Curated annotation (Swiss-Prot):
Chain sites annotated for binding UDP-alpha-D-glucose: 272, 334-335, 352-360, 374-377
Function: Bifunctional glycosyltransferase that can produce both C- and O-glycosidated flavonoids. Converts 2-hydroxynaringenin to isovitexin. Converts eriodictyol to orientin and isoorientin. Converts naringenin and eriodictyol to naringenin 7-O-glucoside and eriodictyol 7-O-glucoside, respectively.
InterPro entries: UDP-glycosyltransf_plant (IPR050481), UDP_glucos_trans (IPR002213), UDP_glycos_trans_CS (IPR035595)
Entry similarity comment: Belongs to the UDP-glycosyltransferase family.
Protein name as catalogued: UDP-glycosyltransferase 708A6
PANTHER family, A to Z: GLYCOSYLTRANSFERASE, UDP-GLYCOSYLTRANSFERASE 708D1-LIKE
């Protein structure tokens, strides 16, 4: 009999992608029936394309479960981004999960970490085991678990964050996610509320492998990060592989990559939606041109779902596009990043250190030039450097900090990463370890097997 696992992803590709990969790992790898609770329509076209692809490619084990949201008035948060508005509407619809869980006849609920505080009580009331999928690194999970206790210790009767010493490394004050400094920030309220409820759930799934973050996983497993010493089991199931889809047309960028020599291309992406200020963007563009390397650069518009091919001329100038025409592919369109990373022609990935991108780089042994921008990115950047996955210049500024990282710094960094043999070798070693972990008898496979075991019981 196939256990029925219900998945509850939050909005955005950062959340949906891991959920989609987990759905396949459970169904194809471990014989589960998986239902993805999905709200229609999606906030963005990429999520909609991903769901449509997932339901066809993973049929019939992976299925759509329609989730109807309670009416939400967007006037409460004027000017708020559509992803946050979808998240808040979902959070308020948490009581509607109870009828959905009973209709689903769920063996277990796997809730997104951002919805955990509201999902867990509903699951608890219905007697359904509730597990949490954490979308970032084990280091971020340890910070998330520890942060409420850290705040409580500093709560004198009658603000911001300093160095956070997680029991069992130090997150320096400049690496703390910027929103956490403001206690009233919406990100901060959810980060604390979700962190507080982690100890009360059945288990936590993390898209990482024990060899990648040995200290963070050990501390979580030992319960070092909580006042009581109690913590639920931690399943290291990463890096989850990309879903196998069938494309019917090869994309131009893939064709362009094929025309380039092995490991000659620097791929540049700052994630699913990060958009950068014109001054930083100019330095980045100039740095790339100055490097002399072939590059594939994906630029994100500030408007969701806008493919602004003409904005390239407005944003960077016609001259830059003209000058780099023979060695670069620059686009504002969505690309299938997982495919690009598996291509032999890619030698370097300049990334924002979003966890999903990092897992993809780790899985394929691609060196990463870490350029963290906000949130968990600096914490993730440190992992890239320590692991040997890539290099991080700590001095480069991030959002809210003064000072432009120049074209010269970018060019030197790119040239060095491409130039030095050790960088590719170290990244390859990370790939080898990740491959060992996800294989049969590997720690990640073992974790998934144990998790499904509990679902069968
Ligand atoms: O043009 C793009 C931009 C992003 N991604 C994918 O979207 C995800 C980005 O998630 P991540 O955690 O890295 O960062 P975020 O988008 O949440 O900032 C990854 O799975 C990428 O492969 C993509 O496929 N194409």
């Amino acid at each position: 009999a196939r256990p029925h696992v219900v998945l509850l992803p939050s909005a955005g590709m950062g959340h949906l992608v891991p959920f989609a990969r987990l759905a396949v790992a459970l169904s194809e790898g471990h014989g589960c029936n998986v239902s993805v609770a999905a709200v229609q329509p999606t906030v963005s076209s990429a999520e909609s394309r991903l769901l449509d692809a997932l339901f066809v490619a993973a049929a019939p084990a992976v299925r759509r479960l329609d989730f109807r949201l309670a009416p939400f008035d967007e006037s409460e948060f004027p000017g708020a981004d559509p992803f946050f508005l979808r998240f808040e509407a979902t959070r308020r619809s948490a009581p509607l999960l109870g009828p959905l869980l009973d209709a689903a006849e769920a063996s277990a609920l796997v809730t997104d970490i951002v919805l955990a505080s509201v999902a867990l009580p509903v699951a608890r009331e219905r007697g359904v085991p509730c597990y949490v999928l954490f979308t970032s690194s084990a280091a971020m999970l340890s910070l998330c678990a520890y942060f409420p206790a850290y705040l409580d210790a500093h709560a004198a009767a009658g603000v911001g964050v300093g160095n956070v010493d997680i029991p069992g490394f130090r997150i320096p004050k400049s690496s703390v996610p910027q929103a956490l400094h403001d206690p009233d920030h919406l990100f901060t309220q959810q980060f604390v509320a979700n962190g507080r409820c982690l100890v009360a759930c059945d288990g936590i799934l993390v898209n990482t492998f024990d060899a990648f973050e040995p200290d963070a996983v050990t501390a979580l497993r030992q319960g070092s990060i909580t006042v009581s010493g109690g913590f639920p089991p931690v399943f290291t199931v990463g890096p989850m592989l990309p879903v196998r889809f069938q494309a019917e047309e090869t994309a131009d960028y893939m064709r362009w990559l094929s025309a380039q020599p092995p490991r000659s291309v620097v791929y540049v992406s700052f994630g699913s939606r990060k958009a950068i200020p014109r001054d930083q963007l100019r330095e980045l563009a100039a740095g790339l041109e100055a490097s002399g390397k072939r590059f594939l650069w994906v630029v994100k518009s500030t408007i969701v779902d806008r493919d602004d091919t003409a904005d390239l001329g407005g944003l960077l100038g016609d001259g830059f596009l003209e000058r780099v025409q023979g060695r670069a592919f620059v686009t504002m369109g969505w690309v299938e990043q997982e495919e690009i990373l598996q291509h032999g022609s890619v030698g370097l990935f300049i990334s924002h250190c979003g966890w999903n991108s990092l897992t993809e780089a780790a899985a394929f042994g691609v060196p990463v030039l870490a350029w963290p921008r906000f949130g968990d990115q600096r914490v993730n950047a440190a992992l890239v450097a320590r692991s040997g996955l890539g290099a991080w210049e700590e001095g480069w500024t991030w959002d809210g900090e003064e000072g432009l990282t120049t074209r010269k710094e970018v060019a030197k960094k790119i040239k060095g990463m491409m130039g030095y043999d050790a960088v590719a070798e170290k990244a390859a070693k990370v790939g080898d370890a990740a491959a060992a972990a996800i294989a049969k008898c590997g720690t990640s496979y073992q974790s998934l097997e144990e998790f499904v075991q509990r679902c069968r019981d």
